[PDB]
From a paper:
ChMDH is also a member of a broadly represented superfamily of multimeric enzymes (i.e., short-chain dehydrogenases/reductases (SDR) superfamily) that catalyzes the oxidation and reduction of various alcohols in multiple organisms. The three-dimensional structure of ChMDH (the third orphan allergen selected for study) in complex with NADP+ was determined at 2.04 Å resolution. In both sequence and three-dimensional structure, the monomeric unit of ChMDH is defined by the Rossmann-fold observed in multiple nicotinamide-dependent enzymes, which is conserved across members of the SDR enzyme superfamily, that includes MDH from various species. Clear electron density for NADP+ in the ChMDH·NADP+ complex was observed and identified the active site in the enzyme. The residues of the nicotinamide cofactor binding site in ChMDH are highly conserved with other SDR family members. As expected, ChMDH showed the highest similarity with other members of the SDR enzyme family, which ranged in amino acid sequence identity from 26 to 45% with 1.1 to 1.7 Å r.m.s.d. for 237–264 Cα-atoms. Although the amino acid sequence of ChMDH shares low sequence identity (~ 30%) with the SDR family members from portobello mushroom, canola, and human, the pairwise structural comparisons between ChMDH and these enzymes underscores the evolutionary conservation of the protein fold in each. Comparison of the surface features of ChMDH and the representative SDRs from portobello mushroom, canola, and human reveals some variation in the electrostatic potentials of the proteins, especially in the oligomerization interfaces, but are similar in their surface hydrophobicity.
Three orphan allergens [Cladosporium herbarum aldehyde dehydrogenase (ChALDH), Alternaria alternata ALDH (AaALDH), and C. herbarum mannitol dehydrogenase (ChMDH)] were recombinantly produced and purified for structure characterization and for clinical skin prick testing (SPT) in mold allergic participants. Examination of the X-ray crystal structures of ChALDH and ChMDH and a homology structure model of AaALDH did not identify any discernable epitopes that distinguish these putative orphan allergens from their non-allergenic protein relatives.
Numbering used by the authors:
A (entry chain B): 3 to 267
B (entry chain A), C (entry chain D), D (entry chain C): 2 to 267
The structure:
């Protein structure tokens, strides 16, 4: 198995000084990814972020992390739907930064229909990115964690992995996120001698990812969220740092719902 | 909008499948979940279509046993659930041969034999393609038929591996795929809320032959973890399949039923 | 040491309750889960004991319908599940009158009508005492009998309120009690692993008369939240009670079955 | 009308409890969840009220340590959570002494030592009274205060016993009580949606001294069932208490966090 933190103080437990964190899908301006990276940078991590289509957005984010926190930071192209791209990512980050201590598997894409209206290829694309893309990052980084004897993998899942969203149909997305949640549990057991694995399941977060949804659908959502509002990505940074850091050295195979209370109903 | 309650008051009338057609994928083995679901449905009066992949002879013998024992019409079809074209063809053939499909039991599946670090990417892909995308292919192929008819019941064989992580054998690709299958039933129950019910059954360790690739000493460790202290038998699951497939469950949709001898209570 | 699989192969033999005795608490109303469970079990050939608290007459009417319709031995007993002495007396009287108890359906229950801040401490205690401790009283009372006989099946009526928080009415005491009932079934399934099975059924909104104190605008809002779009009917639940009480489920223990028209899928 | 997101952008500012007051029940022991939660909150700048039942001297030493180590105001109170009057008096006294309560950590609890057949009804009532109703008593007492102020965070120490049945020791009363606490957090998260967050933490086996009565050879069977292969330490949980108590979790409500070395993954 794995050992308890040697730190007594919580600020020592939360510190990421001397550690390297990778955040996939942190190229946008206010997503879960850039906020997780900001939290880790604030705790002193060196941070590697990835992009797929938004190179300029990721380069801007890296310059912001450098300006605000003075950390070692860098952006990488990664298509998580390709295992070869995830393998190269881990190879390049280990080369450039020396090691990877925590890996935040955060990249994902949305669905826009149920299974009968959607084509088989539309199902394949969402499963390839959201489910197999997360498996590709886990396998690629897990080989590194096994050689080092330590590591933390944090998977961004979704409350859609627990419930079926309404009124928009998106079963392919719901199913892939469900697989991600159980992947965290199953890898926590597989990797029990060398690494922790946990998942965070956000509710409706105002990141821009849902901008393709009509306005009037989004006001229905609000009546279903007990808190009555969308979340903000900066309300999730504490959870990412919690799982990536030594504040959670007995936490493995857990899922943390962050959803304004949506799943309580 | 929505679905209606059974008209039947008697439970025996509710459970009857006389006049109805049931498809069971992966029912070619002699003592698997598939043939026992098919037996239970045929006993209630269903016409039954079963599928095989590699066990063509076992499927023909099962069909003959179903017909002679229960007096029903049955037929076996070759189907590779990992191919949508094969699943679409199955639904078309059964609807042509039998006239309709009232219940579909998505039961075909294959096992994993390693965790993700020891396994290749292709070994992962194979298990997900069969167990997760194969269930999706069958769900989509038959759901177009259910939507046209305005009724239907889809029953998915998941696994307790979709809830917990097996020990000591590593099989994460199988665990993840089955977990996807469980939530697929919940999400499709909501998607199809106007015309069909969808539910899953999550068996524990069932003595079907599927686990024969695992040493017997590892199977002795499983028994100490099962509160009932034994493997199940496929004949102990037939009532759940018939429950979901019939009118005994017209308000049950999006449910999962663990049949694991208590394994998940610890 | 653990429990054994059913001897029967055919589903109708597994489902039969000929020669067995079923107790259903709280089956005094004309269309509740309780009387429909008793009808399902009686249809399968069981002798049936039902209980009442305030509705002695309705329980008597039900015994007479059960006997006329199904030709079985039936009898009504007064029982206050909130009193352990009364549950102990129930099991003692039924065993004296019927010879034994094979299946026990712990179904009696009462609602709450506020959250914890608007409610008094007495209001909390009353709901917990009836719904949680009353289920415990029956389980303990009959469990001593199951342990002596080496066999048995306990079926607990929980609620989807044990999984989610109902909206817009506040009823946290009832939610909490029902969540305890659900986990009581998992925990007793493990505790009683050598001699009896325990499972729960979690109904959604069922048109039994129990929510007749709820206004109409509120009930129409519920329907928009139910994917099936309608209240359930108690006759749609009899199949689940019989499944768990009979030998159709000899590998099923520690399971919960949501019967909620899809409500908890969202 | 709902609750709002933190105004802070920096995580350190979000975690800060400067100017806030935290109550931690049952923090009188030397290495329990309570004193580590209290140390975590003191480290972030909170004023801290801790309670004791039997260990008055242990609580006073803890208060002297908190004030010496962290330079904060701290105070010990006697509280019997099984008595509503005591919990109501606790909130009144802390509000009078400190001015307000911003976060309340409902952590006091007691263990069970048998299953329901070996245990008496008294033994069941005692555990439920302390572990379920004691938590309700604190929730009700502080929630009246949270409602008045329009802000607050309630953190409930539940247990993985609220999710699974421990083996080999039988403790169904405790398991059931902890399952009530877990759902109580979800249900109050919704009831209190306009003014306060409610969340639970479910520890696995933590080396606090609470399990010192368990035979040592039973404890090493536990370790074989924990993927991490060891007991936890209370200092590994202080991060989670501070997370829920502070502004680092202003969109997190109705959540449960398992901290169990992976025990429930199997
Ligand atoms: N927003 C919500 O309400 C919500 C709720 C629950 C869960 N989530 C999940 O949170 C995670 C982050 O999403 P977000 O809301 O923060 O919006 P976002 O800022 O747009 O993040 C999406 C990230 O995923 C990357 N991405 C998409 N496809 C990729 C692929 N094939 N390969 C590699 N990277 C890919 C994107 O990169 P590029 O932009 O460079 O192409 C982008 O950086 C996702 O997994 C999402 O499913 C979001
Ligand atoms: N046995 C257990 O302990 C257990 C526990 C939990 C869940 N399950 C699941 O229960 C279901 C039935 O398995 P079983 O235990 O009853 O053993 P089984 O008799 O061998 O059934 C598996 C069926 O799946 C078919 N199959 C495999 N791959 C297929 C593919 N690509 N396309 C179409 N069909 C394919 C097989 O057909 P052919 O033989 O003709 O090739 C076979 O009939 C499976 O989904 C399994 O994951 C089993
Ligand atoms: N209807 C729903 O929507 C719904 C949903 C989920 C769960 N449930 C649960 O289903 C179960 C049956 O309720 P129902 O809907 O079928 O309505 P019901 O017909 O009124 O059944 C309630 C039964 O419980 C008995 N009862 C109440 N308090 C009792 C006590 N202290 N001791 C002994 N018996 C007591 C009642 O006896 P008397 O009438 O003779 O006094 C009555 O027969 C209950 O546990 C309920 O919580 C109902
Ligand atoms: N240790 C574990 O493995 C574990 C696992 C899961 C959950 N938990 C839960 O964690 C919480 C704290 O326990 P712990 O492990 O940290 O051991 P602990 O140090 O002995 O804490 C138990 C605390 O609860 C107080 N207490 C007991 N009965 C009380 C009552 N009727 N009223 C008020 N206070 C009462 C005790 O006060 P006095 O000592 O002053 O009498 C004590 O301070 C408990 O709820 C426990 O159920 C523990
Ligand atoms: Na829900
Ligand atoms: Na478990």
């Amino acid at each position: 198995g794995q050992q308890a933190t040697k730190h007594e103080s919580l600020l020592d437990q939360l510190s990421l000084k001397g550690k390297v964190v990778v955040v996939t899908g942190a190229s946008g301006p206010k997503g879960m990814g850039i906020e997780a990276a900001r939290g880790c940078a604030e705790m002193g991590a060196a941070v590697a972020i990835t992009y797929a289509s938004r190179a300029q957005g990721a380069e801007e984010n890296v310059k912001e992390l450098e300006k605000t926190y003075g950390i070692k930071a860098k952006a990488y192209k990664c298509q998580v739907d390709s295992y070869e791209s995830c393998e190269k990512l881990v190879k390049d980050v280990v080369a450039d930064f020396g090691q990877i201590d925590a890996f935040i598997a955060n990249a994902g894409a949305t669905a826009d229909s149920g299974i009968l209206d959607g084509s088989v290829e539309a199902w394949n694309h969402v499963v390839q990115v959201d489910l197999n893309g997360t498996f590709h990052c886990a396998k690629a980084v897990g080989h590194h964690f096994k050689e080092r004897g330590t590591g933390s993998l944090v998977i961004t899942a979704s409350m859609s992995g627990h419930i079926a969203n309404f009124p928009q149909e998106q079963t392919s997305y719901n199913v892939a996120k469900a697989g991600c949640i159980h992947m965290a549990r199953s890898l926590a057991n597989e990797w029990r001698d060398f690494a922790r694995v946990n998942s965070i399941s956000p509710g409706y977060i105002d990141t821009g990812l849902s901008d393709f949804v009509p306005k009037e659908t989004q006001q229905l959502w609000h009546s279903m969220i007990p808190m009555g509002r969308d979340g903000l990505a900066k309300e999730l940074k504490g959870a990412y740092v919690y799982f990536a850091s030594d504040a959670s050295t007995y936490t493995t195979g857990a899922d943390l719902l962050i959803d304004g209370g949506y799943t309580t109903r």
